[PDB]
């Protein structure tokens, strides 16, 4: 838990438009060319959401934004990045040991899942470094000091996300949902290709990812950002942790009914917010 | 003009042709 | 059901329980509809 | 004229379940009725025509 | 025969002339087959029901069971079972059905407070302790643990919630051990309207029945199909397609012909229900297959009489069926109605309204007399 | 009832037990034929 | 918390009236062996 000396810039929240952006898969069922009617906890139709950014500035001021956030029934996450600087996330009410913590990290090879009671530094973040100017690798020593009476751990999904490259803008419009029902911690998920620069207008469906039955509650969350041992900006000889660029928006689910389309094929093509 | 219609017959609910063919009909008018 | 009043039953019974008084409730007063639109059915068909 | 159907109690209510019949056979004469009515409207159907 | 049925349904011993809808046919499924994943491997029960150390009701000792074979014949064998009531379900099904996850949550309390541990219920342990949701689904539990959860000088490991500012909700553990404060002074410590919420069981060989512990285990389940996950010990069978069967896929269970379908589901897609929500797809546990389910032929029957004073031969219409699908059917003796007319290989005659089976198709056109339908009718006649 | 499903209730239940569920999907199933004959009669007297 | 508690065969009937009915006081004197509320949930008692 050692955070070296940074000119923190205060978090800002921008606000912007969801469009039609936050729609999943209420369920596992498969139906075709069908006009579904259902009641589900969705991000509504331009809803209006909170923008973030994660960047660092040409005069050593660098924005580490990690603000703690509340939870509510569920949270869409949006996130446009190159360097991948947003690698997981944290969940709890106290977020110390007193009370049990979910963590979801990104270990550059795979991907961690812990439900501990966690001993939460005041921003835990992830320390990546180059080991003998060789080796780019990654450290959770940041995060927590200590984990005990661990009840859930998962080491899996061996996906490095965006391989594509950077062709239109990072190729990496990752789109998330967590949602809390019954004990079951869902994760939807989608990896839209961006056409443009920022959040584009268009719709796709987020298939599930991933629901973990852990049990636990959940009513605050927060971002875990990426720190770099610099060498990451050619050109600047400034010796210290760097950040790259990355833009991240944050939306609630709502209690909303939709109506949703299913093409021949299976898929959700469109919806319509019938409380719009 | 006249699956919504395979799922109707596939719980007791079917649909009797009528008596008269659509050719006989014409024959009358 | 124990009584007519919907707030009634809400307010002296937990939930377990007051759903057999709203089912009652519920049963009754569907009934009470479905007789009265097949009447009006039956009478615009007269009219029409 | 317009459609003749048929519908099928045992089918539609306890379909093939034969526990759920025998509770159905409680009810008395309710498909007999609904039965007769369906074939009474196909009846007229081809009358009209 | 045809002619009978058509006696009983009119409840006369004469028939007059004319076409009678007298019952409905279906075939019937040949063989039953059932597909469970690999899973072999047996859940912990064991280890959660003989545990060496049990929780405080209070803290009460929440156990995930998943990915396993819930073989319950275990649960018998280390069991005098005190207590064995299962709420949602039939414990005697219980080694039939897949269950979505399953929650052990095991405790320590008095014996006269079993009765406490079900939906609905009120007192101390219920109201401070544990509180089960009123639609709760799933088992509970409870046998004497007197032999190992007893002191000479008193087992005062065990503590309970007794004062609490609220009714604990549904699947809620409360932990704190802020002091209980009666009104509204604010308490220091212990003294007037201060009292410590947890109180030490002190269970001891001495005590009585009713006060000695018991240990309580809950099993909540999730009666889902489509995760699947953990079900009891059966053994799948082989799958057939094209045929008429019972199929139990993984618990769900139905009776149709299974056939390969071009339906591309999603990865994460289990099966599929068509436009009213009926189950059209699914999915094999094992070969992860796209199968169509259709259910098994059925329609009505009809007997043609032209008058039980006339004659008694009788004509049957088998309505909305292909011919060959009634003849599979005989063939293979699965059509319900099991009087079967006599076929000569000219009694048989396809119509638009059904198969006709006993009647001859004559080339000729008269007025109508017996109406079949789609401009077919039937008449008595050299 | 507990599910629609006829299947369902028969495997998660004793007989004894299941037949309340059954009988409640018995009641819901004979309105619903119910409601379709009458309003099939009211059309059909309508279309002749 | 009477002193003396009338027989089984002459149980002492009390009338209580005209006086707001605040219940937590029972929860203080009653160990609550048997807490059985027929026909009113005891939770809402305080609401009535
Ligand atoms: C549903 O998926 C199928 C199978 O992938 C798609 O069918 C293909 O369509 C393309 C584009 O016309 C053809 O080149 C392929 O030959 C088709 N494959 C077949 C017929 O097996 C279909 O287009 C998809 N439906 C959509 C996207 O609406
Ligand atoms: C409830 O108790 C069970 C044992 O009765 C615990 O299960 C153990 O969990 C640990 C976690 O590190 C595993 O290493 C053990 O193998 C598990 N089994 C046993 C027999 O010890 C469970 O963690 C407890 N749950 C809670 C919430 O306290
Ligand atoms: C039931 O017992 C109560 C006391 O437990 C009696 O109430 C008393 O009634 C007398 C009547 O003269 C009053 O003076 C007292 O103040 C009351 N209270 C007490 C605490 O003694 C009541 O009368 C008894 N009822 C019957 C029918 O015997
Ligand atoms: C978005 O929130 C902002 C806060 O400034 C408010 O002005 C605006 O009305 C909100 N828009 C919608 C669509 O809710
Ligand atoms: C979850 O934690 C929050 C914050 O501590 C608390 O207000 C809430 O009651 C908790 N929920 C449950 C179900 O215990
Ligand atoms: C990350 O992955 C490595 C292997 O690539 C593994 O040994 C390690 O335990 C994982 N977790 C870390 C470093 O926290
Ligand atoms: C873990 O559980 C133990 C045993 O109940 C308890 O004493 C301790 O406070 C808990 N938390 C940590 C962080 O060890
Ligand atoms: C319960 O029995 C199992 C299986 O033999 C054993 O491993 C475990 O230690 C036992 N627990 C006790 C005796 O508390
Ligand atoms: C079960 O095992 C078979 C091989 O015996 C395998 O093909 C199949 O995928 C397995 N089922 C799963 C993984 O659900
Ligand atoms: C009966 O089956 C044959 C062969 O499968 C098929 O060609 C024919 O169309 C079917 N009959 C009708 C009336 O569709
Ligand atoms: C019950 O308590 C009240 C209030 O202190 C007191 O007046 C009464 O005498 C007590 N009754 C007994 C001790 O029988």
Known sequence: ??????????????????????????????????????????????????????????????????????????????????????????????????????????????????????????????????????????????????????????????????????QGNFKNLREFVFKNIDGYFKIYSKHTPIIGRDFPQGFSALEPL??????????????????????????????????????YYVGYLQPRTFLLKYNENGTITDAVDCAL | TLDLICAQKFNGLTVLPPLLTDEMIAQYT | AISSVLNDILSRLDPPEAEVQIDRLITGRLQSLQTYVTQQLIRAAEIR | SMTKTSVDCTMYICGDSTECSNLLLQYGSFCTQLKRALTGIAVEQDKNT | DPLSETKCTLKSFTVEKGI????????????????????????????????????????????????????????????????????????????????????????????????????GQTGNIADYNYKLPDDFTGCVIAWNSNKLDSKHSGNYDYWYRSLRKSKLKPFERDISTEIYQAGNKPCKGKGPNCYFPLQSYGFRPTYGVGHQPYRVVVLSFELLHAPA????????????????????????????????????????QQFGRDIVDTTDAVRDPQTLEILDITPCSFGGVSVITPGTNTSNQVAVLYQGVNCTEVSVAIHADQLTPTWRVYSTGSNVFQTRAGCLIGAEYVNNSYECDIPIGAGICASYQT
């Open chain 1, 210 to 247: 991933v629901d973990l039955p852990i049990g636990i509650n959940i009513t605050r969350f927060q971002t875990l950002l990426a720190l770099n041992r610099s060498y990451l900006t050619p050109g600047d000889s400034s010796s210290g942790w760097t950040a790259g660029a990355a833009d």
């Open chain 5, 20 to 119: 009678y809808q007298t019952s409905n046919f279906r075939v019937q499924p040949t063989e039953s087959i059932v597909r469970f994943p690999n899973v072999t491997n047996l859940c912990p029960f064991h280890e959660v029901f003989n545990a060496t150390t049990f929780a405080s009701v209070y803290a009460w000792n929440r156990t995930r069971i998943s990915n396993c074979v819930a073989d319950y014949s275990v649960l018998y064998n280390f069991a005098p079972f005190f207590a064995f009531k299962c709420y949602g379900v039939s414990p005697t099904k219980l080694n039939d059905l897949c269950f979505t996850n399953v929650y052990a949550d095991s405790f320590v309390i008095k014996g006269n407070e079993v009765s406490q541990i079900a939906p």
């Open chain 1, 1 to 166: 838990c050692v955070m070296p000396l940074f000119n923190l810039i205060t978090t800002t929240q921008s606000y912007t438009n969801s469009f039609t952006r936050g729609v999943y898969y209420p369920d596992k069922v498969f139906r075709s060319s069908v006009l579904h009617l259902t009641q589900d906890l969705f991000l509504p139709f331009f809803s209006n959401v909170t923008w973030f950014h994660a960047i660092s500035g040409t005069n050593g001021t660098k924005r580490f934004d990690n603000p703690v956030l509340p939870f509510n029934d569920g949270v869409y996450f949006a996130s446009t990045e190159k360097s991948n600087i947003i690698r997981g996330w944290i969940f709890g009410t106290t977020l110390d040991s007193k009370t049990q913590s979910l963590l979801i990290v990104n270990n550059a090879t795979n991907v961690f899942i812990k439900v501990c009671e966690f001993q939460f530094c005041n921003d835990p973040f992830l320390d990546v470094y180059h080991k003998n100017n060789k080796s780019w690798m990654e450290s959770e020593s940041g995060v927590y000091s200590s984990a005990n009476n661990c009840t859930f751990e998962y080491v899996s999904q061996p996906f490095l996300m965006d391989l594509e490259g950077k």
């Open chain 5, 229 to 268: 996950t953990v079900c009891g010990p059966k053994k799948s069978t082989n799958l057939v397609k094209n045929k008429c069967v019972n199929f139990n896929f993984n618990g769900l269970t139905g009776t149709g012909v299974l056939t390969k379908s071009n339906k591309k589901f999603l990865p994460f």
